Every structure is written in structure tokens, then in C-alpha cells.
Design an enzyme around this catalytic site. Structure first.
Site, PDB file in Angstrom:
ATOM      1  N   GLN A   2      27.616   6.638  22.254  1.00  0.00           N
ATOM      2  CA  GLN A   2      28.724   6.892  23.205  1.00  0.00           C
ATOM      3  C   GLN A   2      28.335   6.859  24.708  1.00  0.00           C
ATOM      4  O   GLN A   2      27.398   7.520  25.163  1.00  0.00           O
ATOM      5  CB  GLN A   2      29.491   8.210  22.936  1.00  0.00           C
ATOM      6  CG  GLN A   2      30.655   8.585  23.878  1.00  0.00           C
ATOM      7  CD  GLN A   2      31.475   9.682  23.213  1.00  0.00           C
ATOM      8  OE1 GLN A   2      31.059  10.852  23.251  1.00  0.00           O
ATOM      9  NE2 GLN A   2      32.462   9.334  22.372  1.00  0.00           N
ATOM     10  N   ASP A  41      38.650   3.942  19.781  1.00  0.00           N
ATOM     11  CA  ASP A  41      38.285   5.079  20.599  1.00  0.00           C
ATOM     12  C   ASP A  41      39.511   5.791  21.186  1.00  0.00           C
ATOM     13  O   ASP A  41      39.364   6.633  22.064  1.00  0.00           O
ATOM     14  CB  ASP A  41      37.345   4.595  21.699  1.00  0.00           C
ATOM     15  CG  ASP A  41      36.232   5.576  21.808  1.00  0.00           C
ATOM     16  OD1 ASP A  41      36.004   6.394  20.961  1.00  0.00           O
ATOM     17  OD2 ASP A  41      35.686   5.680  22.991  1.00  0.00           O
ATOM     18  N   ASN A  76      33.209  11.015  20.490  1.00  0.00           N
ATOM     19  CA  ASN A  76      32.688  10.745  19.176  1.00  0.00           C
ATOM     20  C   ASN A  76      31.382  10.033  19.362  1.00  0.00           C
ATOM     21  O   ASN A  76      30.679  10.312  20.335  1.00  0.00           O
ATOM     22  CB  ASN A  76      33.642   9.898  18.324  1.00  0.00           C
ATOM     23  CG  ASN A  76      34.062   8.641  19.054  1.00  0.00           C
ATOM     24  OD1 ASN A  76      33.383   8.210  20.013  1.00  0.00           O
ATOM     25  ND2 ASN A  76      35.155   8.018  18.603  1.00  0.00           N
ATOM     26  N   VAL A  80      33.444   5.167  24.894  1.00  0.00           N
ATOM     27  CA  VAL A  80      33.356   6.044  26.060  1.00  0.00           C
ATOM     28  C   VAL A  80      33.827   7.477  25.775  1.00  0.00           C
ATOM     29  O   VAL A  80      34.063   7.883  24.627  1.00  0.00           O
ATOM     30  CB  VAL A  80      33.967   5.390  27.304  1.00  0.00           C
ATOM     31  CG1 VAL A  80      33.288   4.064  27.612  1.00  0.00           C
ATOM     32  CG2 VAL A  80      35.437   5.100  27.059  1.00  0.00           C
ATOM     33  N   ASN A 154      46.318   0.626  46.695  1.00  0.00           N
ATOM     34  CA  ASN A 154      45.021   0.032  46.941  1.00  0.00           C
ATOM     35  C   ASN A 154      45.154  -0.804  48.188  1.00  0.00           C
ATOM     36  O   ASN A 154      44.825  -1.984  48.274  1.00  0.00           O
ATOM     37  CB  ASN A 154      44.524  -0.773  45.718  1.00  0.00           C
ATOM     38  CG  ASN A 154      44.470   0.155  44.528  1.00  0.00           C
ATOM     39  OD1 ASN A 154      44.110   1.359  44.666  1.00  0.00           O
ATOM     40  ND2 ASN A 154      44.898  -0.370  43.371  1.00  0.00           N
ATOM     41  N   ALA A 168      53.722   7.885  44.484  1.00  0.00           N
ATOM     42  CA  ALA A 168      52.731   8.839  44.980  1.00  0.00           C
ATOM     43  C   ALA A 168      53.223   9.562  46.227  1.00  0.00           C
ATOM     44  O   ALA A 168      53.012  10.731  46.468  1.00  0.00           O
ATOM     45  CB  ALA A 168      51.404   8.179  45.308  1.00  0.00           C
ATOM     46  N   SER A 220      44.362   3.140  40.631  1.00  0.00           N
ATOM     47  CA  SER A 220      44.863   3.255  39.270  1.00  0.00           C
ATOM     48  C   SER A 220      43.881   3.963  38.350  1.00  0.00           C
ATOM     49  O   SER A 220      44.308   4.528  37.331  1.00  0.00           O
ATOM     50  CB  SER A 220      45.212   1.923  38.605  1.00  0.00           C
ATOM     51  OG  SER A 220      46.380   1.265  39.124  1.00  0.00           O
TER      52      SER A 220
HETATM   53  C1  LIG Z   1      46.569   0.585  40.368  1.00  0.00           C
HETATM   54  O1  LIG Z   1      45.562   0.563  41.136  1.00  0.00           O
HETATM   55  N1  LIG Z   1      47.779   0.011  40.704  1.00  0.00           N
HETATM   56  C2  LIG Z   1      47.791  -0.876  41.875  1.00  0.00           C
HETATM   57  C3  LIG Z   1      48.870  -0.884  43.006  1.00  0.00           C
HETATM   58  C4  LIG Z   1      49.510   0.324  43.449  1.00  0.00           C
HETATM   59  C5  LIG Z   1      50.426   0.217  44.492  1.00  0.00           C
HETATM   60  C6  LIG Z   1      51.108   1.321  44.979  1.00  0.00           C
HETATM   61  C7  LIG Z   1      50.852   2.563  44.397  1.00  0.00           C
HETATM   62  C8  LIG Z   1      49.949   2.663  43.340  1.00  0.00           C
HETATM   63  C9  LIG Z   1      49.244   1.554  42.867  1.00  0.00           C
HETATM   64  N2  LIG Z   1      48.670  -2.359  41.229  1.00  0.00           N
HETATM   65  C10 LIG Z   1      47.989  -3.368  40.768  1.00  0.00           C
HETATM   66  O2  LIG Z   1      46.756  -3.401  40.778  1.00  0.00           O
HETATM   67  C11 LIG Z   1      49.019  -4.311  40.151  1.00  0.00           C
HETATM   68  C12 LIG Z   1      48.877  -4.513  38.644  1.00  0.00           C
HETATM   69  C13 LIG Z   1      49.517  -5.901  38.421  1.00  0.00           C
HETATM   70  C14 LIG Z   1      49.657  -6.575  39.782  1.00  0.00           C
HETATM   71  N3  LIG Z   1      48.947  -5.613  40.773  1.00  0.00           N
HETATM   72  C15 LIG Z   1      49.115  -5.826  42.069  1.00  0.00           C
HETATM   73  O3  LIG Z   1      49.654  -5.020  42.853  1.00  0.00           O
HETATM   74  C16 LIG Z   1      48.550  -7.142  42.629  1.00  0.00           C
HETATM   75  C17 LIG Z   1      47.102  -6.895  43.079  1.00  0.00           C
HETATM   76  N4  LIG Z   1      49.341  -7.747  43.704  1.00  0.00           N
HETATM   77  C18 LIG Z   1      49.836  -9.073  43.697  1.00  0.00           C
HETATM   78  O4  LIG Z   1      50.634  -9.517  42.934  1.00  0.00           O
HETATM   79  O5  LIG Z   1      50.019  -9.360  45.025  1.00  0.00           O
HETATM   80  C19 LIG Z   1      50.007 -10.796  45.196  1.00  0.00           C
HETATM   81  C20 LIG Z   1      49.211 -11.609  44.131  1.00  0.00           C
HETATM   82  C21 LIG Z   1      49.531 -11.139  46.563  1.00  0.00           C
HETATM   83  C22 LIG Z   1      51.372 -11.395  45.140  1.00  0.00           C
HETATM   84 CA   LIG Z   2      34.231   7.686  22.276  1.00  0.00          CA
HETATM   85 NA    NA Z   3      50.695  13.643  47.473  1.00  0.00          NA
END
Ligand SMILES: *C(=O)N[C@H](Cc1ccccc1)NC(=O)[C@@H]1CCCN1C(=O)[C@H](C)NC(=O)OC(C)(C)C
Ligand SMILES: [Ca+2]
Ligand code: NA
Ligand SMILES: [Ca+2]
Length: 274
Positions: A2, A41, A76, A80, A154, A168, A220
Site C-alpha cells: 500500500q 481500492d 488495506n 493508496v 486553478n 467555492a 480539485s
Molecule cells: C479542479 O481542479 N477543477 C478545476 C477548475 C475549477 C474552477 C473553478 C473552481 C474550482 C475548480 N477544472 C478542471 O480542471 C476542468 C475539468 C475538465 C475541464 N477543466 C477545465 O477547467 C479546463 C482546464 N479548461 C478548459 O477547457 O479551458 C480551455 C481548454 C481553454 C477551453
Molecule cells: Ca488501499
Molecule cells: Na471560503
């Protein structure tokens, strides 16, 4: 066999787990792309799907599965270790395969979660805008006693501007930022007045479809660390309210710098669960 992801001891979850508190009986809903329920897992006890054509216990993207593993991969002898390995885990599908979701889909998931008695809701998802219904949803979940956690975003920083996403940003939701294994803020982590706590979000290894394990970066990934912590707190002090749980987490956090980029700092579960 693990692996212990560095985020676990970084937040001291391991010290709590060693006390005998692992989240047993605490219900957590992961609002995300679904979860690969057959992963060895993970143990998914139920859920719902609000995305057309996809059942809740499949994850064609992987994101949901990874986030879930951070909250609860089984303790386990393989894979992870989650932050709160004994929690009752629900997969609530609000995002499609491409990782996107609609407002009404997200809102439905929050509402489902509230109605079905969840204790903590994790939303590793967010956007530039909110909706009134979304605000209603979150405010109502918190008011009813559910701890609501979401990734801050992000988007990094730019000058003096707030890059905090919704949900958020709402005040009934904890906004989590990301740090790396050195406890430093990651560059992609959003900033803003609303940022609340930090957790491990860079180079986080976890469960991942199909039956494997992978490393992703993102607020995320920091978010479920927080959700798992709340769950640990609750398993040790079932009498607490959502806001009391919330309070413990931010008050005992480890200070790292100004609140605009770090909120109150890195979460410290052992301290928060005292
Ligand atoms: C987790 O980290 N979630 C982040 C974004 C976020 C935004 C606001 C509040 C919390 C979290 N989302 C992503 O990573 C998400 C998952 C699937 C698409 N993706 C995007 O936001 C991507 C990186 N953006 C994208 O589509 O922008 C382009 C390609 C330029 C059009
Ligand atoms: Ca495990
Ligand atoms: Na907050
Ligand atoms: Ca399984």
C-alpha cells in the site's frame, strides 16, 4: 504493497487514524464525474447521476475516481490510503466525461445530497459564475448541518485580483487552495479574499480508472483532503455542528503567509480533531 500519498501525513491524517478515528459511519458525497465503483481500492455505497446517458457508478473521465480515492481509498494492502478510509462513500455524478457540468445538474446533486442525509459534500469543480439556485442550494445544505467543501480554482493570481471560482466563493462553502509536498503554494492555486484553507494539491497520487493509480495536480485534488478531514473530525466528535467543524479546521491551520494566497494556512487534522 500500500502506498501512502504524501498528503496524508502532511495534514496529519495519519495521526488521527492511528487514534482509531477513520470516518466510520460518516457519509460523504463526491459531486464529480462519477466513480469507477469496481475499483478494488474503493467501496461506493450509493449515489445518483444527473448527467444523461451515464450511470453514477462509472467514470469515463477519471477525475471523480481520483478525488474519491483521496477521501477514502481503502486502508488495506494495496493501492493508496484515503484520508478517511472507513467513510460511507457516495458518488453523485454532476459532470460529464469531459469534466464539465451544467448549473442545474450541479444544483440537483447538491439537493440530492442534502435530502439523502449526507454529512459532507465535496465539490472539486467550479466556474467563473454562480447561479442563484446554486447559492440557495449550498446555503441550505450548510444551514441543515452538512459541511460543504469546494476547490477554489486553478487560476493562479494576477495582481490584486480575486480568481476564486463558484461555488467555492459562496460564504457557506469552504474554498480550498493547493500546496505541494514542500508545503508551498502551488502556482496554479487561485487567490482571493474568500480563500479559506490549503491542502495538498500538487502531484497527488490516487485511485484512477481502470483499476489503476495516477498523479494529478489541482485545487480539485486539495479539496477532498479537506472533506476527508471533516469526516475524520466527525467520527471523533459526532456531536459537532457543521460550522463548528469548519471552525476547527481553519483555526488550527498552519500559517504559511498572507490570507489572500493561503487563507488561514495548511490544514492540520490532528490539531483540529483534538
Ligand atoms: C479542479 O481542479 N477543477 C478545476 C477548475 C475549477 C474552477 C473553478 C473552481 C474550482 C475548480 N477544472 C478542471 O480542471 C476542468 C475539468 C475538465 C475541464 N477543466 C477545465 O477547467 C479546463 C482546464 N479548461 C478548459 O477547457 O479551458 C480551455 C481548454 C481553454 C477551453
Ligand atoms: Ca488501499
Ligand atoms: Na471560503
Ligand atoms: Ca470496488
Amino acid at each position: 504493497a500500500q502506498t501512502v500519498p504524501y498528503g496524508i501525513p502532511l495534514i496529519k491524517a495519519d495521526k488521527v487514524q492511528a487514534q482509531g478515528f477513520k470516518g466510520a459511519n460518516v457519509k460523504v458525497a463526491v459531486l464529480d464525474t462519477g466513480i469507477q465503483a469496481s475499483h478494488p481500492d474503493l467501496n461506493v455505497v450509493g449515489g445518483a447521476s444527473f448527467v444523461a446517458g451515464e450511470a453514477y457508478n462509472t467514470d469515463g473521465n477519471g477525475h471523480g475516481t481520483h478525488v474519491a480515492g483521496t477521501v477514502a481509498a481503502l486502508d488495506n494492502t494495496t493501492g493508496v490510503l484515503g484520508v478517511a478510509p472507513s467513510v460511507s462513500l457516495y458518488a453523485v455524478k454532476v459532470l460529464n466525461s469531459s469534466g464539465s457540468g451544467s448549473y442545474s445538474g450541479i444544483v440537483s446533486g447538491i439537493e440530492w445530497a442534502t435530502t439523502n442525509g449526507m454529512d459532507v459534500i465535496n465539490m472539486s469543480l467550479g466556474g467563473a459564475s454562480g447561479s442563484t439556485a446554486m447559492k440557495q442550494a449550498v446555503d441550505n445544505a450548510y444551514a441543515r448541518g452538512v459541511v460543504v467543501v469546494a476547490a477554489a480554482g486553478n487560476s493562479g493570481n494576477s495582481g490584486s485580483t480575486n480568481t476564486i471560482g463558484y461555488p467555492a466563493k459562496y460564504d457557506s462553502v469552504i474554498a480550498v487552495g493547493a500546496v505541494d509536498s514542500n508545503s508551498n503554494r502551488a502556482s496554479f492555486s487561485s487567490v482571493g479574499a474568500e480563500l479559506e484553507v490549503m491542502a495538498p494539491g500538487a502531484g497527488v497520487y490516487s485511485t484512477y480508472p481502470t483499476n489503476t493509480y495516477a498523479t494529478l495536480n489541482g485545487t480539485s485534488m486539495a479539496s477532498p483532503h479537506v472533506a476527508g478531514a471533516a469526516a475524520l473530525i466527525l467520527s471523533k466528535h459526532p456531536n459537532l455542528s457543521a460550522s463548528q467543524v469548519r471552525n476547527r479546521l481553519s483555526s488550527t491551520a498552519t500559517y504559511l503567509g498572507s490570507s489572500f494566497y493561503y487563507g488561514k494556512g495548511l490544514i492540520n487534522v490532528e490539531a483540529a480533531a483534538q
